[PDB]
Symmetry: D2
Subunit: 294 residues, 4 copies
C-alpha cells in the first residue's frame, strides 16, 4: 500500500564538431562569458527545479563536477550519471530512472540556449501541468533537422515527425521537455530507430497518441539559439554578448537566478562573489546585492 | 462650440557618425536586410498607428519619400515634414503641430530598434492610456547617455534626469513615447537647454510633475538595441541576422505587419511581392500568403 | 601615367529594400563609406587622376561626398552609367577620360587587405604593356570570372560564371590595362545575359599571351560585399582590425599624406571638421605619430 | 636545429567561469582548438621538435589531443608549469629539452595571419645568433611589452606594461632565441609583480645589441584572445576568412603536408576518422587540389 526533478543531457555529440571538441565536451565550451551548460541549468532553475541530474560521458563527468559541485553553493542538489555510449536522448530516462523515482520530471538538452520576456511564466505553465507531457514548438528556417509538429486548422497538434525530408510545418520541437510519471515506462518500451538511437520524438508521439501532449508555441519574440555548428556557436556568443553589453545584465547567471528565487540569501551570494572579485563576473555578483532590478 | 497619430524623428544625427553618414542619413542605413527606419515604422504599426509623420532633413526627405511613398501600399497614410536644423527631439511636436491637430500621439526615434515577446501587448498597454504620457524604462550598462528614471522603494517613478554624470539608476527611457493632447502646449513653452536643444526629458518631467507620467518597465527579456556608434550599429545588424536566419522569419517587415493587422489583404501582399520576387525579401512576402505563423 | 576608374554602378534589386534609397557603394562598411576602400586602393597603387562612374541618380551623392579630389591631392571626375549593362562599359563611358594613357579599373564594392598590398599593386601598375589581373581562391567560384591554370601554373582559360567551374580561383575586382583596352571594349558584343563582359576584355589579352594573372595569396583578404550576410562580415572584419590596431584600413586622408600628396598642414585642416569624433581624432594623431 | 616551445599555461581566474573547467588554449577558435594556431605557426617556421608546456591538470588533455606528433611528422614532448610565475619560466622548464640547440617560444593563445608570414618566420628562424622578436601597432600598448624606437627606427627601450607607454608598439607572443636564452633565464630575478619576465630576457639581448626587433606590419593580423569579447572576434575573423576562401587557417595537417613532412597516403589516413564532417572533407580535398 502506497500513501519535479530535472535532467540535463550533456553527453557526447560524437565526432560531429571534431577537432574543436576533441579535448572537451561541447557543453563545457563557453558561450561568450560562461560555460554552455550554465544556460540550460539556469533554465531548469527558472522553472523552479532544484534537484537536477547531469548526464555526461565518463571522460568529462569530473569536469562537470569540478565546475558545478553538488549544487549546495546555489541552493540546488546536483547529482551525476554517465552515458557510456550516445544511444539517444530518450536514454536519459533509463539512465536517470532511480534518480527520477516516482516524481515528475523535466529533460533539457545541455546545448540549448533560450532567451525572452516572460520566459519564467512560459516555463511555469508547462511545469504546472502535472499530468501528460509538455513541449515547445518554435518556428525555424530548417525544420528538417528537428522533430517537427504539424497542426490542424484549429491549431491542434496532430502529428510529430523526426527529421522529415518534407516538413509539414516550420515548427520544431525545442530541447526542453516536461513529463509526468509515465515517461520512464514509455522510454523502457522504446525500440531503437534505424540509427540505433532511442528517440525522444517516439516518447512525445506516445503521449500524443494518448491525448496527453500539450504543445505550446514559443513565439518568435523568444530566441531559441542554435549551437549545432561552429557558425551557430559563434552567433550564439555574439547574441549573448550584445544583450549583456547593452543591458549590464547577464543571461543565465546561475548565482543570480538562485538569488532571485530566494534559494540563496545576500550573505551567501557575497561569499560566491569573493573568489571572482577581480573579474567582471564576480563584480556582477556583487552589484546584485545592492541594485534593484525589475 | 466643439462636439492616435505617429511621428518618426529621422533627422540629422549631426556630424557624429561622419564620414560614414556623409552621403546619407543614418535612418536610411541598413540594419542587416532592411533600412533602419523600417524598424521604428514597424513599431508604430504594431501599436496600431496608421497615420504617421516622418520628420527628416530637407536634403533626405525625397529619399524617405522614395522608399516609403504615401503609405497606401501598406494601408497607412504617411506624411512628411522637414527639420531644417536639429534643435532637439521635443521640436517634433512644433514641427508636427498641424499634423497632430487635436489627437493623441506617439513619438518614436527613427534609429531605435526593439524586439521581444508580447511587444504588441506592451505597446497596446501604453496606447490604451488615453490620458497622460507613457514611456518605457530599460536597464542599460551606460545610463549616463540617456534620460534616466529614479524609482522609490515601491517602484514609483520620482525623478527624471537627462544624461546625469551619476545616474540614480541603470534605467534609461527608451526612444518611444505616447502622449495625450497636452504635449504640443508643453513643447511650446519649453526653453532651450544649455546645448540649444528642446529636450524630451523636460516634456516627460512636465507630465511627471502633473502626476500623469506612466513609466512601464521594458524587461530584460526585450532587446532595445543601440545604434549610436559604428560598433553598436554592426552589433544591431548581427543581432537581427541571427534571429532571422534562425527562424526563417523577419523582424520589422512592414508588409508583414500590415498584412497581420488586416490593413492589407492577400492580393495586395501578392502585388507587393512581385517586384522583389527574385530576392529573399520578395520570396519572404510570398511565403506569408500560404504559411500559418503563430 | 595611369588613370583610375571606379565603377560604383547599380546592383539592381538584389539587395532591395536595403539599397532602395541609396547605392550600395555609398553605404558604410564599419566607419566609412564603402567607396573609400576601392578609392584607397587606387591611391595606394599610386593613381591620382580618377573617374567615378555611378547611376545617374547617385552621381550628385558621390560628387558631394568626394568633391573634385583637390583636398586629398587627387583630381576626381565623374560620369554616369544609365543602365547595368556590364563592367566593360566602364571603358566606353571612360574613353575620353582615359585618352591615350594607361588605366586601372576597380569595382566600387570590393574590399582588400593585406601585407605588402602596396607592392602587389605597384608591380601590376609598373607593367606598362598588356593587362594584369589577380586570381584569389574562393569557396564559390561560379559567382565570378574563373581562371583555369595548366600543371605549370600558366593561365589557359577564363570563364564568366561557369556552371562547372574549372578551378576555385576567381578574378578579383581590380584590373590594370595598357592602351589597348578601350579599342577591345569598343568591339565587344553583348553576352547571352545581355552584358558587355569584363571577362571578354581579359580573354582578349589572354589569347595574345598578354594577360598577367597574379595569385592574390590566402594571406590577403578579398572580402565579399555581395549579400547582406557578407556586408555584415566585412564590417566585423574591418572593426576587429581597427580596434585591435588603433589604425584604420583605407583612410584616404592617411594614404594621401603617406604618399606625400598633401602636407602636414593640409592634413590638419582636414581634421578640423571631424575633431569631436573618432575619425578626426585619428587624423590628428597621424600628425605626431610614426607608424611603420 | 631550432627547437619549439608552446607555453599554454594558466591564465588564472581572469576568464572564469568560462575557463573554470578547461584551459583557454584547449578551447576552440571557430573550427579547431586554440593551440592549433601557435602549433601551426611553429610548423610554418619549419620547427618539428616541439615542447608543449601546460598546467599540471591539463597536460593529459594536450597529450591526448596532440599525441607524440608522429602522425603529423612532428616530435612532440610535454612538460608542466606548476604555477603562473612568468613566461620566462619556459626556458627553465624547457632547459633539458632545448639542450644546446636554437629555440623559439610562442604563446599558446596567440593567433597570427597574413601574406608572406612564412618568410617573416623563415627570416627570424635563419638568424642563428642573437634573438628576434616582432613589434605590432596596437590600441592598448600598456597591456604588453612596449618597444620604444629612436628617430632612426632603432629599438632603444623595452618596458613591461608601462603606466605611460613610450609608443603603441607591442612585442608579440613569438620569440626566437640563440643558445644564450637558458643561461639568461637562469639568472633572472622575479619582477615586482612576482614573475620571471620574458621582457627581462629580451632586454638582456637589447643591452648587448643582439635584439632584432622586426615590425609586424598592419597588413598582418595579430588577434587578441585576452578577453571574452576578443575571443569572440577572433572566432568571427577566422570564420570570415575560411568561409570566403574555402581554405582553412592554421590546419596543422595541411601545413605538415605542404612542408612535405607527411605524404599523400598519410594525409589520406588522417582524413578517414573525420570524413563525415567539414574538417575531414577539407583534408580529403587537399589531396587533389592545387592551391597556390
Ligand atoms: C526570476 C528572475 C528572472 C530574471 N532573469 C531573467 N529574466 C533572465 N532572462 C533573460 S530569461 O528569463 O530569458 C532566462 C533565464 C534563464 C536562462 C535563460 C534565459 C535571466 O537570464 N536571468 C535573470 O535573473
Ligand atoms: C501582429 C503580428 C506580430 C508578429 N510579428 C512580431 N511579433 C514581430 N516581432 C519580432 S516584434 O513584435 O518584437 C516587433 C514588431 C515590430 C517591430 C519590431 C519588433 C515582428 O517583427 N513581425 C511580426 O509580424
Ligand atoms: C602607403 C601607406 C601604406 C600603409 N597603409 C596600409 N598598409 C593599409 N592597409 C591596411 S592596406 O595596404 O592593406 C590597404 C590600403 C588601402 C586600401 C585597402 C587596404 C591602409 O589601410 N592604410 C595605410 O596607410
Ligand atoms: C607552407 C604552407 C603555407 C600556406 N598556408 C598559409 N599561408 C596559411 N596562412 C593563412 S598563414 O601563413 O597566414 C598562417 C599559417 C599558420 C598559422 C597561422 C597563419 C595557413 O593557414 N595554412 C597554409 O597552409
Ligand atoms: Cl512572440
Ligand atoms: Cl522580461
Ligand atoms: Cl599568402
Ligand atoms: Cl604591412
Amino acid at each position: 500500500h502506497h500513501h519535479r526533478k530535472g535532467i540535463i543531457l550533456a553527453g557526447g555529440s560524437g565526432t560531429r564538431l571534431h577537432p574543436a571538441t576533441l579535448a572537451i565536451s561541447k557543453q563545457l565550451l563557453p558561450v561568450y562569458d560562461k560555460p554552455m551548460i550554465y544556460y540550460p541549468l539556469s533554465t531548469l532553475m527558472l522553472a523552479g527545479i532544484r534537484e537536477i541530474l547531469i548526464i555526461s560521458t565518463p571522460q568529462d563527468t569530473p569536469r562537470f563536477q569540478q565546475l558545478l559541485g553538488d549544487g549546495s553553493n546555489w541552493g540546488l542538489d546536483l547529482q551525476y550519471a554517465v552515458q557510456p555510449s550516445p544511444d539517444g536522448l530518450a536514454q536519459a530516462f533509463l539512465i536517470g530512472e532511480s534518480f527520477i523515482g516516482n516524481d515528475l520530471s523535466a529533460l533539457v538538452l545541455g546545448d540549448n540556449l533560450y532567451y525572452g520576456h516572460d520566459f519564467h511564466e512560459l516555463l511555469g505553465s508547462a511545469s504546472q501541468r502535472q499530468t501528460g507531457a509538455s513541449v515547445f514548438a518554435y518556428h525555424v528556417l530548417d525544420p528538417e533537422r528537428y522533430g517537427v509538429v504539424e497542426f490542424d486548422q484549429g491549431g491542434k497538434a496532430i502529428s510529430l515527425e523526426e527529421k522529415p525530408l518534407e516538413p509539414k510545418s516550420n515548427y520544431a520541437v525545442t530541447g526542453l521537455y516536461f513529463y509526468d510519471q509515465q515517461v520512464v515506462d514509455i522510454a523502457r518500451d522504446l525500440k531503437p530507430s534505424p540509427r540505433g538511437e532511442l528517440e525522444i520524438t517516439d516518447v512525445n508521439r506516445a503521449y500524443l497518441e494518448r491525448g496527453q501532449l500539450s504543445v505550446e508555441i514559443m513565439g518568435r519574440g523568444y530566441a531559441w539559439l542554435d549551437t549545432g555548428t561552429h557558425d551557430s556557436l559563434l552567433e550564439a556568443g555574439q547574441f549573448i554578448a550584445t544583450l549583456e553589453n547593452r543591458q549590464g545584465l547577464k543571461v543565465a547567471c546561475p548565482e543570480e537566478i538562485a538569488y532571485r528565487q530566494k534559494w540563496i540569501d545576500a550573505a551567501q551570494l557575497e561569499k560566491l562573489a569573493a573568489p571572482l572579485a577581480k573579474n567582471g563576473y564576480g563584480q556582477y555578483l556583487k552589484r546584485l546585492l545592492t541594485e534593484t532590478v525589475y
